[PDB]
């Protein structure tokens, strides 16, 4: 059930909503957001399913949604750090 959600991450949803609403209207903006919601709510439930990226940064997992990627780690509960465009992705070194 519970997760924490970084302010930046929340700024990310805000910006995501802005672009979507602008490119496609509120209906579509709202649809895409529920998808981010579902991705996130599922990370909360099944934290271990996200693919780790330990060479990117210690403790980190990513879980994609649409055109975006949810970056999170787990401390005493699941922490949603950033929601970023897949265009940000890069191969991390071992």
């Amino acid at each position: 059930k519970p997760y924490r959600l970084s302010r930046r991450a929340k700024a990310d949803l805000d910006d995501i909503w802005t672009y979507s609403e602008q490119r496609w209207g509120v209906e579509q903006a709202a649809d895409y957001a529920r998808e981010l919601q579902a991705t996130i709510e599922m990370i909360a439930e099944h934290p271990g399913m996200g693919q780790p990226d330990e060479n990117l940064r210690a403790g980190y997992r990513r879980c994609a949604s649409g055109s975006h990627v949810v970056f999170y780690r787990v401390g005493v509960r699941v922490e949603i750090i950033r929601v970023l465009h897949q265009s940000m992705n890069a191969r991390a070194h071992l």
């Binding site: 970084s6 970056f71 750090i81 950033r82 940000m88 890069a90």
Partner: protein, 75 residues
């Protein structure tokens, strides 16, 4: 105008690229590789900084996603 030791493998990889129409020269192929190296190296720094910022942003603990959607739709 630099000098570089390439082994057989890339000796040959460069030729499969240049005998095909991918690139006009060895130098063009190596530039292509470097470009990707540079682009990734830079996406990668950008990513870690982006995640640190997320960590330092502090947290919201009780997020009401149903209401974020409400409010954003109201606007």
């Amino acid at each position: 105008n630099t000098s570089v030791v390439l082994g057989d493998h890339f000796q040959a990889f460069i030729d499969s690229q240049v005998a095909d129409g991918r690139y006009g020269s060895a130098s063009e192929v190596i530039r292509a590789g470097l470009r990707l190296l540079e682009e990734n190296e830079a996406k990668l720094a950008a990513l870690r900084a982006a995640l640190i910022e997320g960590e330092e942003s502090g947290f919201i603990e009780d997020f009401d996603f149903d209401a974020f959607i409400e409010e954003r739709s109201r606007a």
